[PDB]
């Protein structure tokens, strides 16, 4: 039987996460609908996004959030991923002044087993594009440049993309926090 | 403090054998059925009175929203009745039954006694889509009829659609019920002398369930009074999230809380009926 | 006001074969068995206390000199129980319940349920000797033991001698018994919501069994309190003397009076017990 | 086990002078009175009904008859109280209580509360003769309406002869009042968690203020059911024979039993409610 | 269907010249003394058992998680009542309450009967500010105690903090509560006949309250049972937030409800309770 | 099925009984045991022999009683059938004195349906025996001797007996007033 | 307080009592009318109206009945005082043959704590009387006439009768026994 | 008494309403907090304020919330006045690129009785400012130029400002629905 739930509702996370930590024989996945936190810290989200999960499910769950932070706009989106992507889906390059052109990509996981909360933060920064580029991704994905690259996230493979992203190095640190 | 499904399987089939489990059986037993939920039964009447339906439901409960729509106007709670018995006991409803996995384990088992709290036939329309006999028992003049011997006796708790008197659905019904003096509750009052429980399809939050569960278990330690304490039978709540208060609570309440597995809510309590075979 | 013999057959046939008849056992059935009665039971025992038999019996009913008897010494009341149990259920007395016209017909009818408020064990062994299985249940443990389903369940309303701690005979344990909380009293509010009931044995001046007859009456106006008004089944009382008033207030408490030929007590209730076969 | 009227008098004047002594009144109390008592009250109906009224006595007690005067017309039951308004209530009996020593000692003490089971007006009379103002309290109309502080309330406890839809006279309401349900219940209810209790005229086979003695003691010891058991107050029970079985049972029903001389019956009453100022 | 503040004046004024007036004060009563609520108590103590304030909160209501709390350690639920003790009974709700506007509005008026819910000290040590006596009622040892006549019984519905054996703090025991046979459930039985009941400082949502406002009906109807039917007296219920649903659903449980203005709340109230002078 | 029910205790009044209402389809017999009443009128034993035998069958019931008044002895038995019987078997023809030497003898049945009763009520006289003559009677037939005989009651047979005894009218009487 | 409660319902039995044992601290007097038993033994009327005593008053009880045996007559009164002073007052002088003319005067007392009952019998005889004389007395006193007398018990004074009638022997060791 | 019961939590914005409609005999006010909505859309916050402002007073309660539209960011903030004002305080004017320049302010006030809502909106654009210029404001009011003027909604008076301001004209369309 699984012991930890994973929680998402978007698919496209869903299945970056089976590709890494799907034959792990004690996480399971869930699909609950929780009312989404609007708040500007990733930290503040993720936490309170982990007790909106477990009033839903009432199993150890783990959640997921993400967060792109521009220092053209100081913070911003930051964790508030829902109000401008229901708006602005890739038009980010363009209202971005062209000048300074650089942002930081946050994820965050965090597990809760009804006592305790854990959160997991990692961090990956290297500029903004100035066009979409890419298809396989999710929310920001075609518009976000790495370190040392000129392929953005979307235009990487999966393998390639979990290498550089938040979220690849947060699977990997929590299979061996819970075993998975 | 909790069962699996495997290690609550022996224990279900001990008092199956003997003709000692009764299962009772709440709402969520009811929900691949696709029937509504209040949400929008009283929430589409309230523009009768003439509220927005977001704002009707800003004055409370539903249970004390249907108190008000019942004082409101001469028969106008059996509107409400007579538009849940067209959308509960309709015929995609039934459709979804004879295909649903839970009312097919329930009723490829030989059960004495059913008790449930949901008004729609899906219980007894269970047993005979597989070509089983069932006795529906709601009011005063369905115990006293005749029955046969073999049958099925389905109770149901709060009440019958095609028999509106019965209904427990306004505020003041279910304070009313807490005295336990309605007929289903004089036959639980004898049932819990002798039988163990199996509650499915409840939340922890219901209130109305917990009560009952308080009030058996003060009811069967009464029964004991005079007598030495002897250790009686388990009664059972299958769930898909236990948690961690909540189980600790019911064990005081003679109530073993068994956990399932969330990822499909409906074949997690079909393969848990389909285990007491 | 009052039926006979003949009259009352046919109409206790049709509760009989829809599997409704209950009979409702007193002393007087009982009574060709040749048992002590109380006037030599614990004035017998009145010398223990150093009383003289005449004059322990001038200061109280039996049910009263019962309960002065139980808090005189520690370990008292036992005492009275234990020379019962060698009285009532003696040797002789299995012997005369062999021959019994009353219990060979009570026997050869296949009873679903039969309760009795006398203590000896003269109604289960008389199915016994007709070859049936009976089932005894007097406490929570009872209740809650395993049985067959085709067995026939005897309610022992007041208790077994070979339980003790069951056996109302104490005038406070009659008091108590008002309350209805007892586990044969919780039987009793559900079998009442379904059958009809046969009091053979007793008398018009009780005033326990009196009780019990208003009291499930009032139960069974309680239950329909919601619904409209349904006419219920007639709960039936076989005397050998019924008399010109008791008859008329009986039948607000939905009980029909049956006369009996009082030449022979014995030979009469089995003619009637006779009938329903 | 048995208080004389010498030791009971410093018992009594402890719970007067704090204010926490009730008189519970029997029928006893009205006996100089003259009144008449059942056996020519409805012996004399019952030649109406057609009976001789050795006979019509025959069949059953006087609660019991009273219940088949009630079914015989539609109003019929209302014949019995206006004889009874007539007999018990006349001018005869007010110049025997001006004169009634008893009447005269309960008067000549400032009481707070009195309970009565008889339907005459003689214990409110007798306060009224004393120049005191009394309360009388039977219906929910009696309760709700005002009084003043310092006046006396007198319970009727069976009703008064005035509001005839109060009357405690037919078996079944006898039965019905075994519940506590009435207005003089819910208020016996209150007093008996602070207050000690003084009955006055009864017999020990009453068998109704029996049930009464018992059901207050199970209520006082079902008060102090969660917290530690403190010592409650002592009931008193003054008698003119007590005999020698009797005071031992009251004992575990919290009454202490007074024996009053027999010589002359209403002196020593009197005596007794004098020695409490 | 709402009352103001100046139309409800008269009609308390009226309820209180006879004396038959009787606060029933809530948790919105004790509001300006800046106490605890329940969010950072027992989540204070929550570190104890190992959790998080947040995620303790997150598995059921304060009752439910109280009684969590007394099942874990043997003496664990006398550490929250001796927290509860020093915080809500504590010098500086003492000089809150010398000041409170609401509390020297009740003090100011001779009330005969004071009921609360609430666990601190502050209704009787309000009496006291003022010079006025007070007597706390919660268990069956303090209705026994002795009194004087005039002063004020404060009735401690739940319990006080220097009792604990009395609280009713676990859901258990708001459960055990609604069967009404505890010593202050006794004496609201016998205060309902009689009186008029101005309730402040509760919510709709309170559903505690809210049963009782439902059987303190069902208890008023029952006891106008066999006689006709009287109009009663009206209770009260005094808000800030009245709605549109709930004010009409109170109506058919004796209860008008009186909008208060929301802008001070605490000053609304005062100017009830200075109008009833 | 009976409607009447005769009650008795003396199987010899028993058996005079059905000698002559023993065909009757309508009368049962029961032998309740009841407590008899002592007094030495006749019209109070009987009437209130009734009652005791009421509340012992709750039937409507028949009762029967006997009466011996001497003129020598100013009534006495009377119906103190009972304590003379259990001491003077038939000496009452010795302690009565040689002078005068005449009696009466009196029968008496009660009928009670529960809410009225009805006294029949028959006598008979000659004088009494010197000595006791005769086996078949009981109580003071031996001793008993009516106007226009010599032959005492117990020298008679039983068809002799019933002509002239006052039970012997009284269950003609009996008769054709219930019609049995 | 009165321990013992003397019961009686004939006056003039109260006199005598009072005239003995008036002085007596500890002994009441009650008049509760109980059903008189009827009986030809003394010993069993004595002990069965004791009970019927108790059961009226419920306190320590004491009764008192008298009884007359005639030879001539087999008994008879005996304990049947009633019934034949009903109807045959003093008219026994005559209703006797003169012949033997020899009885017995036989008085009981009885009494019971609710426990146990103690009978004291004592018994006076001479003859009786052709004539009916004196006036002072209580129901047979006029004619009966003891041995070594020629003069009543009625034609005796108050303490002439108590030396030599059952009743003043009786009264004599009922006060040594409860001590009175 | 008020009818209706203005809910606030901003000071300033309280003294502005008071300066218009504080003579009203009807208008409460109140301070209780409730948990702000996030979202871009002015019409959906506006309108679920509501129910969260009448669940927490239960009187008839008027809300009302502020947004600002710019044309170079397509929206942004919107009625998202919450997230960017706790980042971004006056930078707007630094963020926005400089090439188009044009924004438009919105207001809009709701009033629900238990039954119905009601949505008033009042709109007004010039274009953003340069750099911060006023101070008596709240929110956004020192870089915002309405059409055909030179000077800010900060440097303008109390009365300047109502005159073009979306809320000044708000308070005329509220007094003359609701009386006050």
Redesign the interface.
Same mark, same amino acid.
Do not use: C, N, W
């Given at each position: 039987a699984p012991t930890w739930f994973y929680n998402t509702t978007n698919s496209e996370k869903l299945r970056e996460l089976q590709h890494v930590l799907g034959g792990s024989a004690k996480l399971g996945y869930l699909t609950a609908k929780v009312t989404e936190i609007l708040d500007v810290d990733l930290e503040t989200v993720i936490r309170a996004k982990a007790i909106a999960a477990y009033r839903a499910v009432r199993v150890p769950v783990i959640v997921e959030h993400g967060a792109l932070c521009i220092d053209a706009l100081n913070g911003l989106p930051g964790a508030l991923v829902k109000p401008f992507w229901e708006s602005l889906d890739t038009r980010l390059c363009e209202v971005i002044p062209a000048g300074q052109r650089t942002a930081r990509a946050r994820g965050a996981l965090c597990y809760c087993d009804g006592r305790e909360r854990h959160v997991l933060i990692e961090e990956t920064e290297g500029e903004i594009a100035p066009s979409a580029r890419g298809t396989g991704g999710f929310h920001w994905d075609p518009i976000f440049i790495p370190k040392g690259q000129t392929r953005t996230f979307a235009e990487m493979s999966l393998d390639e993309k979990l290498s550089f992203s938040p979220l690849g190095r947060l699977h990997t640190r929590l299979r061996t926090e819970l075993g998975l | 403090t909790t069962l699996?499904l495997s290690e609550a399987a022996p224990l279900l089939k001990k008092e199956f054998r003997? $003709?000692?489990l009764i299962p009772f059986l709440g709402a969520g037993f009811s929900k691949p059925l696709k029937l509504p939920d209040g949400s929008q039964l009283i929430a589409s009447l309230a523009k009768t009175l $003439?509220?927005?339906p977001?704002?009707?439901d800003?004055?409370?409960?539903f249970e004390?929203?249907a108190?008000?729509f019942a004082?409101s106007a001469p028969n106008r709670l059996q509107r409400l009745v007579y538009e849940m018995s067209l959308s509960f006991d309709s015929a995609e409803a039934e459709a979804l039954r004879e295909k649903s996995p839970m009312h097919r384990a329930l009723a490829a088992l030989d059960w004495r006694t059913i008790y449930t709290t949901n008004y729609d036939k899906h219980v007894e329309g269970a047993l005979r889509d597989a070509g089983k006999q069932a006795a529906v028992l709601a009011?005063?003049?369905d115990? !006293?009829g005749?029955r046969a011997?073999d049958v099925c006796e389905v109770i149901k708790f709060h009440g019958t659609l095609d028999?509106p /008197? +019965?209904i427990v659905l306004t505020?003041?019904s279910y304070?009313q019920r807490?005295a336990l003096?309605?007929?289903p509750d !004089?036959?639980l009052?004898? /049932?819990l002398?002798?039988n163990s429980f199996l509650f499915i399809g409840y939340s922890?939050?219901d +209130?109305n369930i917990?009560?009952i569960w308080?009030?058996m278990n003060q009811?069967?330690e009464?029964? !004991?009074?005079?007598?030495?304490h002897?250790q009686?039978?388990r009664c059972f709540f299958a +769930?898909? $999230?236990? $948690?961690?208060?909540?189980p /600790?609570?019911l064990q005081?309440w003679n109530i073993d809380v068994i956990q399932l597995?969330? +990822?499909d809510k409906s074949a997690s309590v079909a393969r848990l009926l389909e285990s007491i075979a």
């Open positions: - | 699996t003997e $003709g000692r $003439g509220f927005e977001e704002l009707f800003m004055h409370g409960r004390q929203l108190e008000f004082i009011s005063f003049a115990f !006293q005749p011997r028999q /008197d +019965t505020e003041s304070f807490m003096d309605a007929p !004089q036959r009052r004898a /049932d002398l002798a922890f939050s +209130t917990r009560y308080y009030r009811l069967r009464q029964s !004991q009074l005079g007598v030495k002897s009686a039978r +769930t898909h $999230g236990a $948690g961690l208060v909540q /600790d609570i005081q597995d969330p +990822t």
